[PDB]
From a paper:
This occurs via the oxidation of ubiquinol and the reduction of ubiquinone in a process called the Q cycle.
Owing to the lower resolution of the apo map, the side chains of the neighbouring amino-acid residues could not be unambiguously modelled into the density for all residues; however, many could be placed into their approximate positions. However, our inability to resolve the iron–sulfur cluster, which should also be a strong feature, leads us to conclude that it is mobile and adopts different positions. This could suggest that rather than being in distinct conformations, the Rieske protein is more flexible but does not adopt multiple positions.
Author numbering:
A (entry chain V), B (entry chain I): 62 to 77
C (entry chain O): 22 to 227, 234 to 438
D (entry chain B): 24 to 227, 234 to 438
E (entry chain N): 2 to 222, 228 to 444
F (entry chain R): 1 to 32
The structure:
Amino acid sequence: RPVVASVSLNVPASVR
Amino acid sequence: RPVVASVSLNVPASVR
Amino acid sequence: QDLEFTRLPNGLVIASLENYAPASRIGLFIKAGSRYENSNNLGTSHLLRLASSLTTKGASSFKITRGIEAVGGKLSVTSTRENMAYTVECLRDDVDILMEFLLNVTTAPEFRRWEVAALQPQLRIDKAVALQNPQAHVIENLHAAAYRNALANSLYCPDYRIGKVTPVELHDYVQNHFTSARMALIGLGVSHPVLKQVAEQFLNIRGAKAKYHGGEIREQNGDSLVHAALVAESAAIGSAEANAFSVLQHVLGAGPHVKRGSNATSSLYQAVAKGVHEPFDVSAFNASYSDSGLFGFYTISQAASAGDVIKAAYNQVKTIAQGNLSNPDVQAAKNKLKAGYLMSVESSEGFLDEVGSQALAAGSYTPPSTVLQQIDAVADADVINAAKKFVSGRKSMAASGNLGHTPFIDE
Amino acid sequence: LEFTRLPNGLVIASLENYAPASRIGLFIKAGSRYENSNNLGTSHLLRLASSLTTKGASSFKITRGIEAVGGKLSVTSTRENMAYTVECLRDDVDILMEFLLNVTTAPEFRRWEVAALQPQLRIDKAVALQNPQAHVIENLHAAAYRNALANSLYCPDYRIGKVTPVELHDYVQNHFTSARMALIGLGVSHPVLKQVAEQFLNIRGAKAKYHGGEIREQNGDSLVHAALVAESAAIGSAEANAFSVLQHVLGAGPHVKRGSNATSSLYQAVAKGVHEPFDVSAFNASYSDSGLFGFYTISQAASAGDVIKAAYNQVKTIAQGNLSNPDVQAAKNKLKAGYLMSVESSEGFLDEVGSQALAAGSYTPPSTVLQQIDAVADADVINAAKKFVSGRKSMAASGNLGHTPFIDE
Amino acid sequence: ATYAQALQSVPETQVSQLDNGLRVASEQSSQPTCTVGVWIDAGSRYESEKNNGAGYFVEHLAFKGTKNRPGNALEKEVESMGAHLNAYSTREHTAYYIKALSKDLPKAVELLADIVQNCSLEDSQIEKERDVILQELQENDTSMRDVVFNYLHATAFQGTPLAQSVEGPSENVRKLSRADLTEYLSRHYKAPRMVLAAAGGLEHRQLLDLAQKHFSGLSGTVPTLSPCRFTGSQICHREDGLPLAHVAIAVEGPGWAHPDNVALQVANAIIGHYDCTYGGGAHLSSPLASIAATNKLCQSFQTFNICYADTGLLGAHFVCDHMSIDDMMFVLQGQWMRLCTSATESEVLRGKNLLRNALVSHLDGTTPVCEDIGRSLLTYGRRIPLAEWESRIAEVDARVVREVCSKYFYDQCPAVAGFGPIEQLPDYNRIRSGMFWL
Amino acid sequence: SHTDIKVPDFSDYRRPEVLDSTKSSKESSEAR
């Protein structure tokens, strides 16, 4: 799948 | 080089 | 309400959509993905993606951490091999404060020494949260197998790079890539002249290609289950040829539209349902970057049942390339495509994800209605090629799990 | 040198040199080529599974019973073979004999001794990789070949903490077998060994499909290590020696300490234009099913392909017929030397005795070896390099790779 | 414009009703897409031990055989239409729903009559799925988070129906019948206890005919609730062979209609959450979170506020190593007692401004909107507009919190759980003695 | 499994004021 990273200050880390 | 492993009970470990 | 869309002489795009909604929302899409990394600065964006919430000039790390949670907003960061977004959220009554917090991250980051050293070993954590989801080193290896220089560079950071990263190494990276010519100050739930006022005061400031080669990587990891992928050189976005794959995606298999569904309409998963009598999961793989894209599929199965499954897929596509096809599956596949686009942008976030992504690759926003017409104008003789380019084209492959019965490309 | 064979396919030899230091080596076909996908990293454990429980003895007693007489228990192991070398004085051979066979013939491989011995693998795996060659070189096999020789000597990480003792008994009962072993000895008489095996050893994998592969390791290490090879030939064929002489034609490493290797056609060929350190030599490997041939590179990051494109060109010069005869006879004289110089030592001597006894069923004295070297053709030394250049390729490297090219480049 | 003006500009929902009993509602919007679903009153709360897990077993056959679209023909027509399909069940509520486009909406409603009412339940699929279920109860051993809440509900509500799981024991799944499902179907799927809802670019009257078309044939004609009590009890599935230990603790919740739930959702957010990724670390606001980042005690924790009819569950879930459990709890209780007694007004404004962005950002699309609608229209009665959620919050101050937390945290009889190396896990008595400051 | 799991009955030990599962607590907790 077209993977994408995602972090934040308050959104939990994730992987698309 | 044609590498080979070598361990023992009393020969120190080595790599050919 | 309609979508403003402008451009400054400095190459700095702005848009805005005052929907009169409560939740203001801003996203600053930028071209800073790890494709712009060279060999020596790898695993950098993985750090920069967490370098948010650090010291600035206009503010401290502490104050920003609290100043947001007082109003109760957010500071999320999407980052791709192309791009690097600084998404936020808040209520519209306090946008002016959160604006200032943002730009100080991008415009006046000091990147001091000691805050980084505490923040480096975080990478070991973040690197491993993904790889609990095992896709995220299979999939990186495709780029690292197929492509060479830019897109081969993973989002995440290798191990050894940790404890070796420099702050100076960022200032070169920042001063070269957070630039008024290649940015996009998108907003939402907010008026346009405001954003026009901000950038002119603070953002008033100033890599190679993806050479496809054909590569192959293997990972005997002892994991009981299998993960694999076979692809071919695709086309970049903008070309209607790109959509020809993205419709073929839905022809072939797009994942479960139905919970616990047998995906019967999908020509692929149906094609393996014969002969096989055990679980497996598989779908099309479509990627479409600016320089190029990638297309193929992604496999899940047991160890002994890897090539037994793939040799349906690699055959199933050849059936398509040999002209064997019907029209309702296509129009069905189009209707799938026409759905998922709107359904993706149903949410403001997923909406936002499309707005500036066009503003960077293109310099224009396409409303969805115009998108559907280009989908309407697709040719079966291009959907074929398409698969012919896949089959006739050079190949790249990767997989993980046990590999006691995994074949190679040529097999 | 005595040299015999039993009906069970079990070879024996012996050479009573009247020396003080008795010495025994039990060359066996148990290298990790015989491992399948599920039993990987096993020989790395079995290579340390020595000094564990047996039936005829305990782990403790063997550890002390050797050091009392002051002997040794060393273990060489290759992708083909697995040797149990020992040493002692000739006055106490009878004891140390019994200690050996109990390791191979009656190993229990209990549970708890293994669990303590597994995490040792993390140590042994890393001692090598302080010497960075030993994951570059493994990757060649894992890149070029697929099934058998691709399997490294050492053990992957994840396999640790997952190995089973039952998984060995299948491996042992299938591969420590009277048909494919060689009870070599030294400093000892022949009828003794004839007596031992008949009492205790009285008991009963795929091919290396070359494919062409490529692996890369951006490790951040300042220096570079790289290798480009081609499908070679297996031993026994005189074609094999055609490479092993070409080895010395091209470059065989420093015969001279701190020497500029001027006679070596390769290192000389890079000495022009380059003005910085680098080190490089021929790579020759020759297994039973096949071999491998090429070279092994060391340089800086920016100066990888700048160097390799001399080597890949230098070999083409040879393949295009450009060559002289004294370099060949010089290269032969190098080959004729290193063979005898290798077997000058009893250990290195022993390393040759049974290695032939497994691949072949006959020992060739060195004199006969030199004649086959004498009968080599320049039109084979050429293809040779033509097979290298015209042949499919496999490659691997490590270090920084900011300027490392691929095969086709 | 402003915030308060924005909430008044929202599309105010529209409600309908039918002779059979089926509530219907919707909300127009400028979204060209749309979604529809069927939120109802049914779950493991009403199944007995003989029919436990059944409503989950209903979930897997309802899309695998009907009277007019048998087999994968039903599944086919969606993929031909280009839409998604999704479902889930809860201990009280169950929901099927669709995401599709506006113009193809009429085809959608025609299906759910063929699904809900006219399910076929082929014996082959009954037996095939009966293996699929037993495949998953092996899988959910891995879903350690779901293990805990399953244990947790099984303790505090012991002896009641609600202690049941949602998927049920393996045994009942290996004894279930077509007829128990027929009876279960024959009692719970009824108009007076069902809801239809949708959102997107539609109109409330396009829809009203379709319900009067299809679901008008529904049987519009049933026990009521036993008050499910609460228990303060401890459970502990000691297991040292794992890396870590998922842990949970909670107390009695008030329930849906009880208004102070607004206050508690703040206090959960006053304490907030943290999991091993937030670069704030030391700089964070939740004192719990800062310490967890300081000394790296835990790796993740979360809070919650469940709402059931006359009760709910308030508590938290946290995840740490076996050499850190006691201190987290000591700090954790150290926060609850702080709010029972000493709650700073400025810190309240933190959470009041957290919760606004919660419900709003929760409502980003159409599917979340109909989660709330199909849920509120079985719990709260009406829907509550967002301008009303705000006015309730604006009444709040620290005087309220000190009354509420004193009512539901302080000195109560909590419920505990644990699955992992809980060797450090103190006793329920010590935990309760740590519950009241001084 | 972890769902076939069941809690036994303490009705031999509990207080009389809570044995009726159909009732609710909070009416005797203040007394207990």
